[PDB]
């Protein structure tokens, strides 16, 4: 769809991205006002459907994520939603165009705490076909 | 479309929001997200707010759909607040494939009383 003329440059030089290109505290934000027990279920069910809302706590940057290849209901592969790689938590991959630059959101979340670590990656491959 | 500002994305514009506003009070204007490049009608759009203090402010009617490049929000409303005059960064998600995300920093300050 729409991107700035020089994505990598923007991704590497701007504070918004840099402050987001290194593993930092992330936290699920779905059903914010509800019993933690339920939220935990919501999170996993949503993860199995390939979607979630995870905000970067430090900056309050909220993101709605889709765990599917940028290309494109249908269960996500273990590449975008991994429940094994590490018992207790789930590793997530989510492509998107953020502020005009193709990126990939990667991170994991503790199925118990519903908090975790994640960051943004420049998606070279996607960026060039745009 | 009313008064508009650029978002941090080169593909979207959104309405100008009050610099400061009261918690749970209707906005002086209908919040609008305008898409520059083609975006099919029906495409879902959502708004989310946060900052260092309140990482994910509660919102009302923060979902809308495109109709001729414009996603008009019906009584969007900021319930959560920003606190110690620190304002919200809006996250606008346009659900194309993959989703397109546009941020609007220091878009609005939400306190309990307002101006």
Comparing CB atoms, the residue among A33, A71, A97 nearest residue B101 is A97
SS3 B13: strand
Residue B96, Cβ neighbours under 10 Å: how many?
21
Q: Record the tokens describing residue A7, joined without a space.
A: 């994505």
- The SS3 call for residue B18 is coil
Residue A36 CB neighbours (<10 A): 10
Range of the domain at B2: 1-115
> How many structural domains are present in chain A?
1
Nearest C-alpha in A relative to B45: A64
- Calpha distance A127→A99 (Å, rounded): 13
Which CATH number belongs to the domain containing residue B68 in this structure? 2.60.40.720
Q: Are strands A89-98 and B100-111 parallel, antiparallel or unpaired?
A: parallel
If one counts the domains in chain B, the total is 1
Instruction: Resolution in Å, one decimal, please.
Output: 2.6
Whether the ω angle into residue B98 lies within 30 degrees of 0, i.e. cis, is yes
- B26 vs A38, B3, B91, CA distance in Å? 31, 17, 19
* Domain CATH code at residue A53: 2.40.250.10
Interface test with A, best of B55, B81, B83 (most A CBs within 10 A): B55
* Spatial separation of the C-alpha atoms in residues A120 and A102, rounded to whole Å: 10
Sign (positive/negative) of CA torsion A55, B87, B58, B9? negative
Contact A64 B96 (CB under 8 A): no
What's the distance, CA B53 to chain centroid? Answer: 18
For chain A, give the secondary structure using H, E and C: CCCCCCHHHHHHHCHHHHCCCCCEEEEECCCCCCCHHHHHHHHHHHHHCCEEEEEECCCCECCEEECCCCCCCCCCCCCCEECCCCCCEEEEEEEEEECCEEEEEEEEEECCCCEEEEEEEECHHHHHHC
Nearest-CA distance A17 → chain B (Å): 12
Give the sheet arrangement for strand B70-72, strand by strand.
B4-6, B12-15, B32-35, B70-72
Provide the experimental method for this PDB entry.
Answer: X-ray
As a whole number of angstroms, the distance between CA A60 and CA B5 comes to 21
């Amino acid at each position: 769809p729409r991107v700035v003329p020089d994505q990598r440059s923007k991704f590497e030089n701007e504070e918004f991205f840099r402050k987001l290109s290194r593993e930092c505290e992330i936290k699920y934000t779905g059903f914010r006002d509800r019993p933690h027990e339920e939220r935990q279920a919501r999170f996993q069910n949503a993860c199995r459907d390939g979607r979630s809302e995870i905000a970067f706590v430090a900056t309050g940057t909220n993101l709605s994520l889709q765990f599917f290849p940028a290309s494109w209901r249908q269960t996500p592969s273990r590449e975008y939603v991994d429940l094994e790689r590490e018992a207790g938590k789930v590793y997530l991959k989510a492509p998107m165009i953020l502020n005009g630059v193709c990126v990939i959101w990667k991170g994991w979340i503790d199925l118990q705490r519903l908090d975790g670590m994640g960051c943004l990656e420049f998606d070279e491959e996607r960026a060039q076909q745009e | 479309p009313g008064e508009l500002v650029r978002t941090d994305s080169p593909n979207f514009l959104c309405s100008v929001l009050p610099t400061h506003w009261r918690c749970n009070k209707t906005l002086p204007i209908a919040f609008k997200v305008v898409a520059l490049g083609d975006v099919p009608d029906g495409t879902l759009v959502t708004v989310m707010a946060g900052n260092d203090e309140n990482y994910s402010a509660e919102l009302r009617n923060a979902t809308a759909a495109m109709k001729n490049q414009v996603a008009r929000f019906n009584d969007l409303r900021f319930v959560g607040r920003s606190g110690r005059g620190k304002s919200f960064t809006l996250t606008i998600t346009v659900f194309t494939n993959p989703p397109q995300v546009a941020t609007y920093h220091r878009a609005i300050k939400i306190t309990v009383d307002g101006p």
